[PDB]
Amino acid sequence: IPQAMQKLVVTRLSPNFREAVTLSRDCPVPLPGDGDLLVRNRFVGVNASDINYSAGRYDPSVKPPFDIGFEGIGEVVALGLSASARYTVGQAVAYMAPGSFAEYTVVPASIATPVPSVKPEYLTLLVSGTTAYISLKELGGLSEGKKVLVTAAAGGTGQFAMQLSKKAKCHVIGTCSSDEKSAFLKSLGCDRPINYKTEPVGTVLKQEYPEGVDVVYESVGGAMFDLAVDALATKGRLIVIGFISGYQTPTGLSPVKAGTLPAKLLKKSASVQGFFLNHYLSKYQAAMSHLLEMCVSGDLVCEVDLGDLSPEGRFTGLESIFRAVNYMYMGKNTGKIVVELPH
Ligand SMILES: NC(=O)c1ccc[n+]([C@@H]2O[C@H](COP(=O)([O-])OP(=O)(O)OC[C@H]3O[C@@H](n4cnc5c(N)ncnc54)[C@H](OP(=O)(O)O)[C@@H]3O)[C@@H](O)[C@H]2O)c1
Ligand SMILES: C[C@@H](C(=O)O)c1cccc(Oc2ccccc2)c1
Ligand SMILES: C[C@@H](C(=O)O)c1cccc(Oc2ccccc2)c1
């Protein structure tokens, strides 16, 4: 329980993470209320939308300064009396809540997830795993022999959309930007990995899947979204999970050729369905429970990229978050990008 700590703070609204966010060095350690845990963060998750958050896009009325980081895993170092009925000092806990980019974060006990130990694999589940699980269960209409296309398939959430679709006996196609990532996809049971830098995705889908794909787990936006719509089967479902190709722009939007979208959907009786995890929190506990079971049992690969093969090596310390965000946006990661705060 130190007097002071470091944390990241959004000091200016911008999708340029380095220009928006400051490493603040002499911050008091916040104290937990009656219903709160104080978590010493050991690993924190880097998420594409960290730059949407720094840009102010979740609530454009809220001015800087504000905390940042959506998820953490670590040890309970202090807690309020009511919280102590369910949690104990020293316990491993994980959470999805704002302000994880800090050495210590106050988290309401009611939203914390107990975990068996502090491993970065368990953090991969909190946002990336639950997003894939809930969207596909609630909106995917998966069943044996459906064809599922997953974009950013070798990324944090993509790896789960791939594996969970396979567990539903689907035939799965996955896009990624390298042969190393394609090999990773194959190792997860991907039926058709596509390196979109060396193989034209539109041609692959037209030639190999002429009747189309039944479900798209679409994270990329832009030209990839356009191709995905064209590739939809009759009654197919494209799920808008995100559009990372656009987040760095002033609006966060990626250009699409969507003027003909209503016509295309009518012609195919097909759909475009958005998904925002925070609209489905009633499903979160059950998703996390099943994901954790599969993770511990070794029935789910939870790939972690701690940056050990990045230019400057392992993502250690809050200062490495800047590098880690850049790494994501250079498309370099395989699995979930995680930063370690060692102690
Ligand atoms: N709807 C929700 O509630 C929700 C929740 C969590 C995440 N998401 C979304 O899921 C997506 C993935 O997020 P993540 O945090 O798991 O990241 P991630 O997939 O681990 O990393 C992003 C990957 O996207 C590709 N990429 C990066 N920059 C790109 C660009 N400029 N243009 C095109 N492709 C680019 C790269 O893979 P390739 O090798 O394939 O290029 C990169 O590895 C994002 O759209 C995010 O907003 C949505
Ligand atoms: C119980 C069964 C089932 O509900 O089909 C199952 C087994 C293994 C992983 C699952 O997780 C998911 C979750 C979403 C989509 C596909 C599979 C779901
Ligand atoms: C009970 C659990 C724990 O203490 O975290 C455990 C015990 C032994 C080996 C494990 O191996 C792993 C490690 C990472 C993810 C899944 C399984 C995980």
Curated annotation (Swiss-Prot):
Keyword field: Acetylation, Lipid metabolism, NADP, Oxidoreductase, Peroxisome, Phosphoprotein
Single biological process term from Gene Ontology: negative regulation of fat cell differentiation
Modification Phosphoserine, positions: 271
Family of this protein: Belongs to the zinc-containing alcohol dehydrogenase family. Quinone oxidoreductase subfamily.
Modified residues (N6-acetyllysine): 7
CDD domains, per the entry: Mgc45594_like
Annotated gene: PTGR3
Location in or out of the cell: Peroxisome
An example Gene Ontology molecular-function term: zinc ion binding
Function: Functions as 15-oxo-prostaglandin 13-reductase and acts on 15-keto-PGE1, 15-keto-PGE2, 15-keto-PGE1-alpha and 15-keto-PGE2-alpha with highest efficiency towards 15-keto-PGE2-alpha. Overexpression represses transcriptional activity of PPARG and inhibits adipocyte differentiation.
Protein known as: Prostaglandin reductase 3
Natural source organism: Homo sapiens
Binding site for NADP(+): 157, 177, 181, 196, 219, 241, 247, 275-277, 333
Top EC class of this enzyme: oxidoreductase
Paired cysteines (S-S): none
Catalytic activity: 13,14-dihydro-15-oxo-prostaglandin E2 + NADP(+) = 15-oxoprostaglandin E2 + NADPH + H(+); 13,14-dihydro-15-oxo-prostaglandin E1 + NADP(+) = 15-oxoprostaglandin E1 + NADPH + H(+); 13,14-dihydro-15-oxo-PGF2alpha + NADP(+) = 15-oxoprostaglandin F2alpha + NADPH + H(+); 13,14-dihydro-15-oxo-prostaglandin F1alpha + NADP(+) = 15-oxoprostaglandin F1alpha + NADPH + H(+)
EC number(s) given by UniProt: 1.3.1.48
Domain of life: Eukaryota
GO cellular component, one term: peroxisome
Pfam family, one: ADH_zinc_N
